[PDB]
Amino acid sequence: MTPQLQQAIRLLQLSTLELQQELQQALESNPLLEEELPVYQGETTQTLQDYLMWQVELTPFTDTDRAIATSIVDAVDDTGYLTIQIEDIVDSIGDDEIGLEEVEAVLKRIQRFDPVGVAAKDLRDCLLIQLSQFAKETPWLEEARLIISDHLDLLANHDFRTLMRVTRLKEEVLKEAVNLIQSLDPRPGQSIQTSEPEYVIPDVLVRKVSGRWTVELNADSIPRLKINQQYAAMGNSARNDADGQFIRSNLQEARWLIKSLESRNDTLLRVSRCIVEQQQAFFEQGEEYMKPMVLADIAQAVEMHESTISRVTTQKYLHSPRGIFELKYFFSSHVNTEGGGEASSTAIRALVKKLIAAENPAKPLSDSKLTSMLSEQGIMVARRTVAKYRESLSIPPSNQRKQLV
Amino acid sequence: GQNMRVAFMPWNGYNFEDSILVSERVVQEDRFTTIHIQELACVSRDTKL
DNA sequence: CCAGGGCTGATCGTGCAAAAGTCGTGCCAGCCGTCT
After folding, report:
1. Rg (CA), chain A
2. In what order do the strands lie in the sheet with A204-207?
3. Which nucleotides in chain C have some atom under 7 angstroms from a protein Cβ?
4. Distance A201 CA to C36 C1' (A)
5. Which of A194, A195, A196 to mutate to test the interface with B (most CBs of B within 10 A)?
6. Residue A242 carries which DSSP code?
């Protein structure tokens, strides 16, 4: 259990990308071989920056106004808002001469460009600009203008009763005028490209042929390190014996590394069989039907230790037709059930999800009610466990989730 | 195809070397009218976010 | 010349106890609907 074993152990504890990193990185030190034109098509997408630049050209400004504008549009973000500030642009242009209204003048015309309200100044001038745009024949333009001007702080509380006595408005009529503001649909910069590229973590594969799915690793992902037969034979006929020692050392380390790697692969596959042997239930039925598993149970299965499996299963991924999942995800705690049995936490989690999703949306169910329901089904859990499982699933509120009945 | 009454004569040069003159009765009777079918597919494209 | 003993390079075993994270669940404080 010296150095060689030591390094072989850190070999399986890490993800496959850092594994290939170290493998390839250490494949340059010792001779151990691993083993319709240029542009695919090429297309230059436009985007809400180039589209704002297009308009600048067409429009008539002077040589000085043109620069200001270039600078302004640089500050525009994906959301649609001038990023910095008004005076900031004046201070960044380095010329003390140019007035602060100079930029305003330009900036007062750039924000009626394509999406109007682009390059707004702090998520409010948008409405002002957007409203001034359409005609004055709209029913409650006065009222809405007055609201937006100085009375947004009050609107923030989603309150309407206070707005009557503050700004001298009518009885609920403003409310219909407040709906006009709701239809404004701010942030016209976010008309951006929804070109979010696709992501993946493929590692081991599970496929369901003739019942009893068989687990087998990826054909391409897994790295195969072989030895050179060419440099092997070259050690016996070496001259200075320095050469020979060099080649012997390279050779022995290579064999070592090879075996280590293989050992990793074999261990991964073995741990990829046990789970499938234990958890056929999950791949067939779902999260609702998972059985609990511990490291100690997997080590006891096939001549294994806890410590060893603990490292294999860290940052490892499995693709099944159910989905893509980490191996660490399968292992979870258990609770005492009816008839001496043990129920997995994932089953209770899916049950809580499906129970909250199918509850009456008019009046929400309290955690105590859910605890009582679960006890009636034969699960026998506390209110704290239910609270934790509910909070864990990006649901802080239980009773605050109340919509219009 | 369909059986249509044909003739072999010039008519103000609307029947050049490889052109064919068609009457209006052909359009009214919906003759040679075809139907094309296309498909549009969309995926959810699950991502990290 | 052959078998017995010492020298030495070649070859390997993926376990084991100690320090830290986790949940089952009780204890306790803050908040709101209702009747007094």
Report:
1. 33
2. A214-217, A204-207, A317-320, A323-326
3. 10-17, 22-27
4. 63
5. A196
6. H
